[PDB]
Design a protein around this ligand. Sequence first.
Ligand SMILES: Nc1ncnc2c1ncn2[C@@H]1O[C@H](COP(=O)(O)OP(=O)(O)OP(=O)(O)O)[C@@H](O)[C@H]1O
Ligand SMILES: Nc1ncnc2c1ncn2[C@@H]1O[C@H](COP(=O)(O)OP(=O)(O)O)[C@@H](O)[C@H]1O
Ligand SMILES: [Mg+2]
Ligand SMILES: [Mg+2]
Lengths: 513, 85, 171, 85, 49, 51, 173, 460, 107
Amino acid sequence: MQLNSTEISELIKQRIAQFNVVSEAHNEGTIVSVSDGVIRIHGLADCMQGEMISLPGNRYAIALNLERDSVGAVVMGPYADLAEGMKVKCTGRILEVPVGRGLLGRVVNTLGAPIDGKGPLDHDGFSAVEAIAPGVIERQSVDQPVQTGYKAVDSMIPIGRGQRELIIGDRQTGKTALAIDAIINQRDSGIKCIYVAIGQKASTISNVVRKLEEHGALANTIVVVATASESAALQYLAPYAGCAMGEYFRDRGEDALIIYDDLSKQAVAYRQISLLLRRPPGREAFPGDVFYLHSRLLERAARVNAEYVEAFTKGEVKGKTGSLTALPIIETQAGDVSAFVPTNVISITDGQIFLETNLFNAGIRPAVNPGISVSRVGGAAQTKIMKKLSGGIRTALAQYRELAAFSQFASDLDDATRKQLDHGQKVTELLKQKQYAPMSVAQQSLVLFAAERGYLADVELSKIGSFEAALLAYVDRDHAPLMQEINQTGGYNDEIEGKLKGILDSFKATQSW
Amino acid sequence: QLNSTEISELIKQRIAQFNVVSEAHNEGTIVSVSDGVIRIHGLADCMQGEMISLPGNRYAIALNLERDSVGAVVMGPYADLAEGM
Amino acid sequence: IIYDDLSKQAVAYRQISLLLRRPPGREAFPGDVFYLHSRLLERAARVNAEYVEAFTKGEVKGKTGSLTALPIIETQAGDVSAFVPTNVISITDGQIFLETNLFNAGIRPAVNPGISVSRVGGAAQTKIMKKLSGGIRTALAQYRELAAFSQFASDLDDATRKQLDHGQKVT
Amino acid sequence: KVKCTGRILEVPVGRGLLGRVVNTLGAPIDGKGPLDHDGFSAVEAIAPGVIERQSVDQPVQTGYKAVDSMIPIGRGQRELIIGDR
Amino acid sequence: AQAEIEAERKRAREELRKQVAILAVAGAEKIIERSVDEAANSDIVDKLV
Amino acid sequence: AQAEIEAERKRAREELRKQVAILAVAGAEKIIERSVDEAANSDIVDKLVAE
Amino acid sequence: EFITVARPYAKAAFDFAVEHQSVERWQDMLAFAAEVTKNEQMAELLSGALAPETLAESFIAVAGEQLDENGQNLIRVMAENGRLNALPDVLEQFIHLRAVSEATAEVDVISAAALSEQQLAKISAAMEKRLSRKVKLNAKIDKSVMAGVIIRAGDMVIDGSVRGRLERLADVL
Amino acid sequence: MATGKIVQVIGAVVDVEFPQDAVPRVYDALEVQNGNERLVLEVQQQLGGGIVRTIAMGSSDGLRRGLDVKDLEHPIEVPVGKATLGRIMNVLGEPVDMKGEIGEEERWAIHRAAPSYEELSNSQELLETGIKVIDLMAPFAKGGKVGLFGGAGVGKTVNMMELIRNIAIEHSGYSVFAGVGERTREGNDFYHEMTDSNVIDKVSLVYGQMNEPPGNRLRVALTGLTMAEKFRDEGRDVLLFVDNIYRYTLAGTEVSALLGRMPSAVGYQPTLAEEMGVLQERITSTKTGSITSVQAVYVPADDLTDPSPATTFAHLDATVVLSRQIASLGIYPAVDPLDSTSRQLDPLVVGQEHYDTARGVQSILQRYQELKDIIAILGMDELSEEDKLVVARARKIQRFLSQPFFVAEVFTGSPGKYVSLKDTIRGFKGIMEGEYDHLPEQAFYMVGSIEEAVEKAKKL
Amino acid sequence: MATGKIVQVIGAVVDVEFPQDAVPRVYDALEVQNGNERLVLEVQQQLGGGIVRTIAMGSSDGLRRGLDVKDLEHPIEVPVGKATLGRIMNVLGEPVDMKGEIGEEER
Ligand SMILES: Nc1ncnc2c1ncn2[C@@H]1O[C@H](COP(=O)(O)OP(=O)(O)OP(=O)(O)O)[C@@H](O)[C@H]1O
Ligand SMILES: Nc1ncnc2c1ncn2[C@@H]1O[C@H](COP(=O)(O)OP(=O)(O)O)[C@@H](O)[C@H]1O
Ligand SMILES: [Mg+2]
Ligand SMILES: [Mg+2]
């Protein structure tokens, strides 16, 4: 399909024919200094703070300091080949990014340029990266479920559309796995997905993209990439580009979910860019406004009322309420939640899914820690059946954990607690599942029903993964008409209670694990 | 390379005649105001610890007699003050 | 060669570097404090016979030269995480840690084994000492493992009581 | 006025230094008269390179049961002695 | 497929050596807007291949 | 597999096009350098001074 | 580089020169001082740790063609602050300040060859409409342009060179 | 022709002034005559007009203001290829082994961009080290990274020597060793161990010694990376040994403090994580070849929490944890089997047999660590008869995963042994299942394959 | 009549230069046309030579150097009294509520 070199010739001829011969005035400055990624520019009297300055080589710098006689800008890309005396041009643009459905399902960097190798984007218009969040009166309460597909999170820690949930934990405890499984689970909801990776090594992004397209979720998500080796300016500004790309959907009355991978690395990149500009430091050398770094980001994750979207879209949409859901990830060191950036982001978000390392190493995966993890939006964002089934699980598990801590010193122990310390040990063995296996509300619901109404009390040998798999296969064969009702309505009734009793009774009596 | 509180019109006054000490050593002019600390130009007669009288009825305490300016602190509300007083 | 208080050469160099208005690092020490001690301590070396024979232009043959360095460092309340202790602990081939809790209890010289390392090991021992030292290392290691139970002794089994009271006799 | 010698700090060296008390410039301070040195050597010098070394396989004895048995020192080794005051 | 595309590219390269003869004076006569001097290909032999 | 082969076809086509782009524009440069006249430079400048 | 230290002195000198109707004399006085600042021997003296007063007198002496108002005061004030090496910039700022009040612009033009003096007068009259100043063109004969012209009016630039269009086309591809 | 002139010298930091036409760009290499010696400088910053701020690679003594400086218009570039095998070089690619010139044929700049995520090759081919405990408890694939964490004196350097030997005369692939912050004694011992063991002809050695200016120590990692990348482009599966990352971060701290940058959380440089990323992001497998890597990491004062070990953790795929307690009990290699981990240790990539054997070993050792204090208090004759068997099997496992190294012979005299992964799994899987409950414990200490255990017991 | 010029912009900190005699006082409020929206600056320091250092009560992006700044002769002033009951306001006394306008009698 390439022998037709007339195709090459016609491409080149079209590019020549449509070259424009006239020239236009532009404002120009000279590079006076360059070091560690920062350049000083002389000239550009009309440069404006936050503007994009175009360097020779089709790359940009962001004018951060407008000093009295020079402009201090940070290069977005490889700076080492710049040299004093080169000339730069001022674009009339405050930092932009492309937005729209057209980049939905494509891999791009912080500037919206496609690193995917599949041609140019088809955006509609551009959005300012550093925007402002909706006001107090333009917002709405969050009472719509978003399902992460994980029994532990969807039952104990419900997430709502417009909520901000912190995924916090030590290194290598399944944070990225939980995040991209929450993405994959949105294959077929109305929620669009966005994954921003900050400081990730390129092999992790390659694996993430392969898994996203393998499980069929790539067509429904935007991937924004600032790898571990790219200039700190690109890593510091990546989550704002991702937030603008998701806020495009928010403002049109649709639902988006955005995952910031290692905000605790955006803070490090901002610390670097700040110290290289000689700005005064604060508690751990992080600049003074590091709180105002994450705050003005996570306050853009909001659910917005119908009047706001109606007025923004100039009346083209009437009944919809838009929303953007944020799942920032934070890495702690030896689980000291009380560190500086973790205790800031915990003061910003509306909950945290604390992932405990000693549960993760013990094979409990996902290693969510009950008690210390909460959702302050809570049951308002939980479908009715899940809310009914899950009410006890969290406190039952926390008290099971403390009782099983006591147990090690107390052999020959009361036969009443002997049963609590076994039901807890079965529920904690039930709420752990394979990695890329998201589970619908019905499959979680009837499993939690089996566990809560005592049907597990005779499987007290821990052959209980096979029990779950066989129960799901059985229900998927016979009673698919009930799973459809549960998945469509999420409702719960005494009639559905009886139907589930019937399913469990018929399963116990007639099948094997 | 930084400035040291020498400014255009004070340089112009020195340009008019270098020996401005032909003027009174008894007085000067406020040059900057920040968080209650004040910088004054002139006051060749000032001595450390001296009470300097400001417009209104306020005093400042001369803490520093530097090469060309006096650094003092304001004993009262300072936001009412301005350059050139 | 013994250098007594390299941690005072470091202070004199900090003074010189702070009076020259050089950029201060951690604890106001200059950036090149490591490059101060390393190019000192790396001068302690064993040298092969050909270097000696070439340097002296004959007049010596077969012999190998040597220079052994024993730098001394003072720590403030036993903290090793300081700047100069970190550099010198990173440079040298091993450490002899002298601790005050052992010195007070009468263990003198108060060398703390296990926490103290020599990376030359037996290569720098007579074969009799190399033979005999391994059982001392293992005895003190088992003693350090059991020492938590010392103030609960007379509760213990006799088979571990023997190890516990053997480590005390080695100490 | 200051004149720049092209020289670098050198220090006396030799066998006559053996048994003397000397300050960092090589001058005797014990009062037992001048040095019987063997020329001078540069204070700042370059250590022997990689290929000029040899493996440390000779003991230097401390006479302490605690050190020679469990923290051996060899001729050519560098051993830090670290502790509190 | 690799062996297909290899020889496909190798066939293309020889024809683009003809097409460059047009495209170079095309880029010239787009720029000045002056009709280019044709027969100025006295130089073009080194640019041809 | 066919998608990956298509990606490599894209790569090879773009590379060939970029090589011909470099050489074509260099030839245009040398043409414009050799073939020029004052009656053309004055026309270019008279188009510039128009705005 | 000391643009920032020269701004106050240039502004004071200019704002004084218009109180005494002698901008034109001040400009050449500062030009003389800016030249004396460059000599290899004087540049050795200015680096040494002389007292500001005697170092100022050692600078007045080599320039007697100066007003009482200008040299014997400005040079002394700059010496007290140790700013004399800034003189080459105090000149340029001064010139610039003048061109601002006199509503003038030193437009620069660059070309492969001389312009016809009809082209150049049209350029003058057209820039005076683009801007709001009396322009003062000065041309440069740079061969790399090959054809067309570059018009630089400070930080604004209009590029009509065939090389600029060529290397823009090279990036259209 | 030389066009630059020195205008300052402050320690290792040199300022050079050039014509404003010809200012060298960042990371360019300048050259000057420090007397009769030739000294190269690396441009760190283009501060001010015409001036350039640089770090001297050699020592800065003897420099004087006004010397002429000649700017090489390319970064520091080193020889690469076959010609560098068996040689020792400094950061500038000059031979420091007195065997004459390198015989170079091509030179590569040490600064280059990392492979893009599209060029990476997803791979899961496990390496087979000769070491039982590392093969079992912490497998790692081609292109992966392994960190040997531990204190001082635990065996990181000799473990890397053993790996170099085993992957140079069992699998015959090339290897590169970048001794950043090397100790000259240890570097000479390494050279003589590799020359005595015949493997020297398949290892390329770069040394930046501790008595050299900070940036000279800093750029050595990139020099070794560039040699490994040249071997990768030839299609090889190279293996890169970094002798200590902690001293690379210390060299970065020093050079950042010399340039007067504002320091960071613990006095570390601000660019810490970007230097670590620019180092570790070039070490990857690609569609043509691969660079695998193992890195020694010294943990200062025994905490995994300070910026250096904390920032290197983000890049490793496997972590081996060495302990001086286990080493003092006379077991080598002193790997802690419970705390060492790998991302590739799951049934899907190692197979269910390997995964089950590893998890069973860890479970047995954990149960023994539990029983140890009941044994301490109540004596052993009180344990239940299945616990008296867990004890013996854990005690035999704890012996069997020690091993004699070929390079440790000079410490012990006994010969080394290379153990295939099949024999390792067979041995541990046999021990846990009781096939060897009749052998003494000392039949497993410092043996190779289980056949040596049975033969030693037969001899014992 | 505006009289000042923006001379620096560094983050949320803005320096503006006034005639030597018209320098604002310490807590006075200035304002600027940041594109279409007006922006209020609260003075924080008086530096030498008529320069005044202020902090922006709003987004700092989009500000050029040399923009004209207008000196309000009073600090930030807000509405007060019964008129403000049941409303929502921001720092500048502007309704961020959308019920229209505050009919205050006094500020
Ligand atoms: N539910 C699960 N079941 C089994 N294995 C899992 C599960 N979740 C994660 N893992 C495994 O744990 C390893 C670490 O996972 P992941 O990278 O998501 O954690 P992380 O905290 O993002 O890592 P880091 O933050 O250190 O880069 C992965 O290799 C993955 O295979
Ligand atoms: N497998 C082993 N056999 C014998 N001795 C060993 C072994 N491993 C380490 N050692 C001893 O440890 C000392 C230093 O080990 P090394 O590898 O330098 O530790 P580090 O990781 O601190 O560099 C050596 O002198 C050697 O005697
Ligand atoms: Mg992760
Ligand atoms: Mg080591």
